[PDB]
Structure formats: structure tokens, C-alpha cells
């Protein structure tokens, strides 16, 4: 289906560049807010506009609500479908680092990639997306 991982490409005065990455899942395109800042995005003579968004959470969904609801168990490795600018997609298996915040316990990917890689999905062993790279994951069973 249209389900998959997509480069968010942009073109303007700065030529063509990769603004970020997002995921189409259950007819909703998910990415990070700072990537698009709520701008419209084309999908082949078909424009998508924000349905839901949070600046503070830095998350945004086009065409419907945020669909991902699974969390990291805080034990097992995860895989990031890394979509770097100017390189083919790759799966990278890694162990997130647990970090405590006033809002709750959080996991983050220790890997470092260029700017436009943000939004690359993080999967658990079941293939469920538990967060986007550059935004992290939540803890829970």
C-alpha cells in the first residue's frame, strides 16, 4: 500500500534537499513538527495538510490522528529504518538509553545522523513503530 517510509523532500532558493523523514501508516502520514512546521505536502497531485499537531511534543500527523500507540519495554533492542539524505535506507539495530524526565521515563537513540534524517521510524521486534528518530520512544508494556 501507500504504507511505508518516505523522504520529505523540499525545493526552493536552496535548491532541492531532504527536509526530513516520515511514515505513512493507516492512511496517516507521521513526522516531526519541526520538519514541516505545518506546511502542506504534495503526494502526487494530492496535497496533505495537518490533521493533528503538537509543537511542544514536536509531532505532527497528516490526514488523521497519530496512529502509533505501542511503547518500548525498556529491555529489547529496536531497529531504526534510517533514511539519511543522499543514501539508501538501511535498518540499524540498537539499544535505546533510558532517561528520566518530569513528564515520564523516556528512551532515545544514541546514533548520530545528519539533520534531514529526523523522522526515521523506530520499530520493535513485532514490527510496530514505537517512535521516530530525533523524538525518541516512551516506556511501557
Amino acid at each position: 500500500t501507500t504504507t511505508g517510509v518516505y523522504r520529505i523532500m523540499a525545493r526552493g532558493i536552496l535548491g532541492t534537499y531532504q527536509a526530513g523523514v516520515g511514515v505513512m501508516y493507516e492512511n496517516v502520514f507521521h513526522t516531526l513538527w519541526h520538519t514541516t512546521r505545518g506546511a502542506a505536502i504534495m503526494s502526487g497531485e494530492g496535497k496533505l495538510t495537518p490533521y493533528w499537531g503538537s509543537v511542544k511534543e514536536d509531532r505532527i500527523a497528516y490526514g488523521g490522528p497519530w496512529r502509533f500507540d505501542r511503547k518500548w519495554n525498556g529491555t529489547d533492542d529496536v531497529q531504526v529504518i534510517v533514511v539519511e539524505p543522499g543514501k539508501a535506507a538501511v535498518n540499524i539495530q540498537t539499544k535505546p538509553g533510558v532517561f528520566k524526565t518530569p513528564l515520564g521515563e523516556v528512551g532515545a537513540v544514541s546514533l548520530d545522523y545528519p539533520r534531514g534524517t529526523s523522522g526515521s521510524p523506530i520499530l520493535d521486534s513485532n514490527g510496530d513503530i514505537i517512535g521516530l528518530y530525533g523524538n525518541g520512544v516512551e516506556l511501557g508494556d
Binding site: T3, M9, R11, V21, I81, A88, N91, G127
Partner: peptide, 21 residues
């Protein structure tokens, strides 16, 4: 001038066994 944003498919959503190996 023109500013546009669009989507370009890069991968399927999937776990890969080889990535573990």
C-alpha cells in the same frame, strides 16, 4: 519563486534479520 514539499518512498516498514546479524 517556488517553495514545495513532497514525499518520496524510501523503504517498507519492516524488521530485518540481517541487520541483527
Amino acid at each position: 519563486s517556488e517553495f514545495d514539499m513532497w514525499l518520496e518512498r524510501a523503504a517498507d516498514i519492516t524488521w530485518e534479520m540481517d541487520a541483527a546479524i
